Amino acid sequence: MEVPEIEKQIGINLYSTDTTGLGGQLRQEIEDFIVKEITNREEGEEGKYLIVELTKRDWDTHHLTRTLSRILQVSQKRISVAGTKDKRALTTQKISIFDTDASEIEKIHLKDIELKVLGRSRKSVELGDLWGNDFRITVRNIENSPEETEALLKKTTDEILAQGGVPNFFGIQRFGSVRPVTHLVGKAIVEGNFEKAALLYIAEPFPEEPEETKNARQFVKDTLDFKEGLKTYPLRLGHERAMMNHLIANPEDYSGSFRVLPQNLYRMFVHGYQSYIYNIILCRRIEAGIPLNRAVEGDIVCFRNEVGLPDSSKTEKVTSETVNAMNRLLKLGRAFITAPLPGYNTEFASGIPGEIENGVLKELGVSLEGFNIEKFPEMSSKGTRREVLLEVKPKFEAGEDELNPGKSKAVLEFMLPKGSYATTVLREYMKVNPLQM
């Protein structure tokens, strides 16, 4: 088949499913993307925190909270969410509001916003206080008929249901906010180059950015005139600006140009390059014909940390004897085949899977001894071992779409746990450019 360069530039280069790309488009209509949160907490009747179910239509969370904070005259902090839902969509979620009574929110009537009291609690709603998110996505404008699409959906589903779900690939958005350069920067540092790792972040324009800022980076990218850059770069880019300043007093000090950014990107770059390698590996293994929900000799799995979450801490290695027991646990949801996120404390697997892992680090010319940045040790990671399959059991629904006469539409509704993304599920169903998505 065919995969966009955009996705091949970040390790991904195929599809666990051999079905045809459903194609089509998304977010054509606000209601075409419904996301309903699943809570993991309970509230009572007491507490200085009012808990409300927020339903918003085509609203940006920051904007909403900034609106409610003005109406209730409290700081933005007093209103928190468990997780930020998409603006262009119809989304429901739980939130908390400090020192506010039920009756007050019954008098607030904003456009495309619905507020419903759930109760009260002595505890605010912190990022993470939710189990998962129910989805109801709708793909429209497919070059197929309702009949040829429903059948196309059932096949894509079947393989999925059989393989256990969809690959746990690192989305194109994970490598960068608006510009996916993290992995590109983490690769230069490892190799030792700081002249490029710093420039790739300071400059290096992308077709996603406005031709204005796009021309600001392009400028210093071929002139290295950081003095001008600190004059053209919009204040919006604090990190890039902070770095150019360090380069005005300390010339050619690209090595320490990273000591201006907090612990955020500080380690995101290296983690990116890791996610990159991890993608490739996950593919090569999908090519080798070794499924993601079945163990083999020296496959290396993980177990849930007694919290219902797979952790790269306790990782038992499967052998020629425990193989029968390992696979038996997978179908019981107590183990998961994992893939390596290269570092300096990585434990390659053995057998066929071990060959794949070593075959990716080989062609890539990767060096485990390289994940120890000399200039920035704090920036050097030892590696981890993320799972491979992303549990998912979708339910499709095909048909004719009114908005696009002659074309068909698909209603994909499933659910994911906090930390996972819907694009990861959609890609196997639409198999289209991540930007056309």
Swiss-Prot record:
Name the UniProt record assigns to this protein: Probable tRNA pseudouridine synthase D
Function: Could be responsible for synthesis of pseudouridine from uracil-13 in transfer RNAs.
Residue stretches making up the TRUD domain: 165-390
Biological processes per GO annotation: tRNA pseudouridine synthesis
Signal peptide: none
Family per similarity comment: Belongs to the pseudouridine synthase TruD family.
Organism field: Methanosarcina mazei (strain ATCC BAA-159 / DSM 3647 / Goe1 / Go1 / JCM 11833 / OCM 88)
Matches recorded under InterPro entries: PsdUridine_synth_cat_dom_sf, PsdUridine_synth_TruD, PsdUridine_synth_TruD_CS, PsdUridine_synth_TruD_insert, TruD_catalytic
Entry annotated with the keyword Isomerase: yes
Active site: 86
E.C. numbers: 5.4.99.27
GO MF annotation terms: RNA binding; tRNA pseudouridine(13) synthase activity
Record key words, sorted: Isomerase, tRNA processing
Entry keyword tRNA processing: yes
Family matches, as Pfam families: TruD
Catalytic activity line of the entry: uridine(13) in tRNA = pseudouridine(13) in tRNA
